[PDB]
Structure formats: C-alpha cells, structure tokens
Amino acid sequence: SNVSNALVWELTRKSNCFIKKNKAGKKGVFLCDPLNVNYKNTPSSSGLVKSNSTNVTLKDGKVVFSVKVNQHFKMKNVEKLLQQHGSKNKEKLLKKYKRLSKLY
C-alpha cells in the first residue's frame, strides 16, 4: 500500500504542527502530540508515527488517560486500565502519571 510508519516519519519529521522548537535555548526541540509518552521529536515516541499506543495527558483541569481507534478515561484506576488495554514504557508511563498527578 501507499503509507506506513517510515513514510509518515519522513513526512512529519520536519513539517508538524505539534513540533515546538526552542529558539532562545538552542538545545530544545519538543514534539507535543497528545500520544507522545515523552516529548522527544523521535519516531521512537511520536504519536503520529506509533501504530497503537498509551499516554496520560492533562485536559481542562482533569488528567486524561488516552489509548490509540482513540479512547479516553479519567492512580489505581489508571494502573488497571493500562494493565488491560496497554502493550519499559508502562513502567515509565506510571511514573509519568504520578508526576503529572501532583498538578492542579
């Protein structure tokens, strides 16, 4: 067929509306798609590139668990949901959720 992950990455490693690049601080490039586990500009992490994936975000004052077509859910409940629907990363994600959880 005409489209697959490598092609998507070539298409979106430059042009990409959720790339945000740090002009003032020359080191920084982030990729802020809502399915990025870590905010790296990498097809390791890219929510565009990844075939099916799991991420915790924050939307309108509530932390959201999303899974990739596309679901949404509202610590133990998150842990159970990840254990279920998910597929190193889980462990990282749980850690990310704890850190995220602190915000209000």
Binding site: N22, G25, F30, Y39, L58, R99, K102
Partner: protein, 125 residues
C-alpha cells in the same frame, strides 16, 4: 583568561569589539569583520582587537548549559509547559517578557507545582 567553573569551561569572556568603536561615535560596538586593504585587525597585528574565530567555541557536551545546569526554555503560556514536566531536572523555565502579571503569576504557580526552576522569578510584582 579561561573561565572554569565545575563542569563548565568557557574559554573567552569580554565580548568582542568592532575595531575603531573606541574612537569614532558612528562605528557600532557589536562585531564586524574588518575587510580592508591593510588595517591591523584583519592582518592580526600584535595587541589589537583580537578577531573571534570558531575554535574558541564551548565544549559540545555542554554547549548551551546555563549555570543553573539546566537548559533555558522561554514560556508565554501554561499550555507550553506541558512537555517540560518530563525534563524538570534538566530544563529551566524563563517567563517571556511580554507576559502580563496575572498570567505570569499563574505560570510561576504551575511551575512550582511541577518542580521546575523559574529563573526570572520576581518579575513584575
């Protein structure tokens, strides 16, 4: 001379000066490469306005890192701080100059919760 501190060596300080800016007002202070048929500076005469050149450059494993030991990131909205929770130990926020005091306060508060350093902390209060 060399300005060592801990893991951070920067080789050169005293920001390079456009030749002749000492003794004519019109000549701007920020750098310019002299061209000139013969002029001292291009020709590298002893003890006169030593030309910058790339080899002076900071080490490549510490290239932009503030004495904070964290990379500076400019922020004008709380949404933009959504990535930097995952790098709180290695990037530090600066709140953008334009940002009004009500919003600015909110950004400071979010950062504190998120456990990330805020460099221009006391601004506009």
């Amino acid at each position: 001379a060399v300005k060592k501190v801990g893991k951070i060596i920067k080789k050169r300080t005293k920001k390079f000066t456009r030749f002749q800016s000492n003794r004519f007002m019109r000549v701007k202070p920020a750098w310019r490469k002299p061209r000139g048929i013969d002029c001292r500076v291009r020709r590298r005469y002893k003890g006169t306005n030593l030309m910058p050149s790339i080899g002076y450059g900071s080490n490549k494993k510490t290239k932009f890192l503030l004495p904070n030991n964290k990379y500076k990131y400019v922020v004008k909205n709380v949404k933009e701080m959504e990535p930097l929770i995952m790098n709180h130990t290695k990037y530090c926020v600066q709140i953008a100059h334009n940002v009004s005091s009500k919003k600015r306060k909110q950004i400071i508060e979010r950062a504190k919760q998120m456990n990330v350093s805020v460099i221009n902390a006391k601004a506009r209060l």
